Symmetry: C2
Subunit: 348 residues, 2 copies
Amino acid sequence: ATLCRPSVSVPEHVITMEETLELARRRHTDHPQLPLALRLIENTGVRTRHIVQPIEDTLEHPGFEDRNKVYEREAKSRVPAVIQRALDDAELLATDIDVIIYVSCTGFMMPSLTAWLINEMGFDSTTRQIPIAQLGCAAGGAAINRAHDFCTAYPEANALIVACEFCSLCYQPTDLGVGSLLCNGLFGDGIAAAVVRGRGGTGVRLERNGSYLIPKTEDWIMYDVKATGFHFLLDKRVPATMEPLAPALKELAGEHGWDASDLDFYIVHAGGPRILDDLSTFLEVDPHAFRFSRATLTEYGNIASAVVLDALRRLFDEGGVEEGARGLLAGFGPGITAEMSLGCWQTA
Amino acid sequence: ATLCRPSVSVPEHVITMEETLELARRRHTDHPQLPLALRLIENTGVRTRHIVQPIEDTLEHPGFEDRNKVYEREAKSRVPAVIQRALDDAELLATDIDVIIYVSCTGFMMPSLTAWLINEMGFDSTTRQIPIAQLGCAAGGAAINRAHDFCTAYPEANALIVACEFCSLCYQPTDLGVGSLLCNGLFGDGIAAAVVRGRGGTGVRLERNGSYLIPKTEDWIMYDVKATGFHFLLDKRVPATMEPLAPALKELAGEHGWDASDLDFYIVHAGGPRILDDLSTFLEVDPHAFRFSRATLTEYGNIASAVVLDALRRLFDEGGVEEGARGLLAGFGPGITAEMSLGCWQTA
């Protein structure tokens, strides 16, 4: 199985770094840790982010019920187009996909969108649905690792990975801790869809994938679930966790031969360049390695599960084609979990 | 791969038909359709149901935040014990497990409980985790199929399927419709766990699992997501859906040479003797083939995704199974979805 050209699309409402600082200032003028909050946000290097609703509406909280209503409306009117362009690239019709893998942690619906997608997109009335809402920033990589595992089990199988993240719909005016303030300047909205044809595609070439859970960090990247919806909690110690994770990247990187970090491919998702830079040290590649990841964050912000996919999408546009260059696709999030994936680039 | 003896545990707080009727009467004394409602409940044949909190606590709504806290505590103090027995029956320690497929739709947490399990359960730091919360009553079957597919990709793989459901945590005093009144008398709480060994083990051997999605029935079995949590919506037309679904079973049965509509081992979960009977006619078989499912509903009520597993548990306990006898495992839920699985019995 080979990962094809991920298709990505973001909403039309844009919020700049400068604007974020203004709002944060005006909205927290009395906050005792305000200067610290603003500095942290600015250092993030996130110049722009996109949101599905105008800024004045996203700042308001009409309740979880209305927020979640916005979630399904915006996903129904936006997801379809993206899935399309993802089929066109992998060169398949709705009917060549055996399994849909829908990941989103920014809203909740049962059934998930997969059912409505099969109905409207004219998918196979037999397509398997695999909705995962509990893996957050790591869901991107996990989707890959699944579409992969699936294909190996059914060699002629094509999987459709769809990532839909409207992080702006999880904004909680009530969360006043500096961590919250940070997060409010970092996450954005984005949608990604990529096909993984095992038949023989053009993109990253499947090899060996693997998971890794950082012991006792369960509550380090999590959701507090309240009447107001999902409140995101990110422990101050998250970046430092890069040290314990580096080895897990090497351990698996080894059990494939490509072994050494000394690779040509690096598409990893880490929230903010801070955490991404601890990975460019503890691992010992080079900062510049995660040029594509950092590019998504700089222009879109942290769009959760969709980051990996958009990084790839950017690796295609610059598309050199180093042909068979190594490869390390990884996602990090709730767990703390790490969905790592090793693969070679394949042309055809 | 072979499905092993699923362990099942239900909470100690019991609620009978009689008291359910009494509560419904006492609380909806003025409901215009109170008579219809009581007859309907009494007609489901659900003698008893098990809940995690005493009935007095179950009936009050302390809010979604608290309700969800109750979900977490209860899952932590009850799931482990049940997983233990499942590991023991399949005969193994937490370390032969290559993945955990966690299904639950009656509460929400991120990360899901698999992360916490991996740690306290002393599980293997590299254990894959597939949590699915948006498949409802059909999640039990979906989990079996996913454990399957995995054991295919990795023959030496041992998958752990956990189904935790505390439907009582989704009780909404404010839902007054007759459908809601009915559900309040049908759903119960229960935890299931089973190991799917690609290698050894005694139980039902894999051999062809498929899926089907009844067209244009997305809002027929769904959740309304509000500040109070999840409000369950079941359309009055669901039992009738058994007509269009029966052919979906035969259709996939023949693809394995065993359709004809006459297997030697039936374990399907529809959602009430209502739906079950329609199935035992459109599939043209005697309702007695579903005796295992019916027993679960009669004794535990509708424990959502855990039903198929506890149904299988039923079969094991009675044995007498033809070591070679054909079989069927299926779950029905939001979609409307149908996760099916064909397989023959087997012994070590």
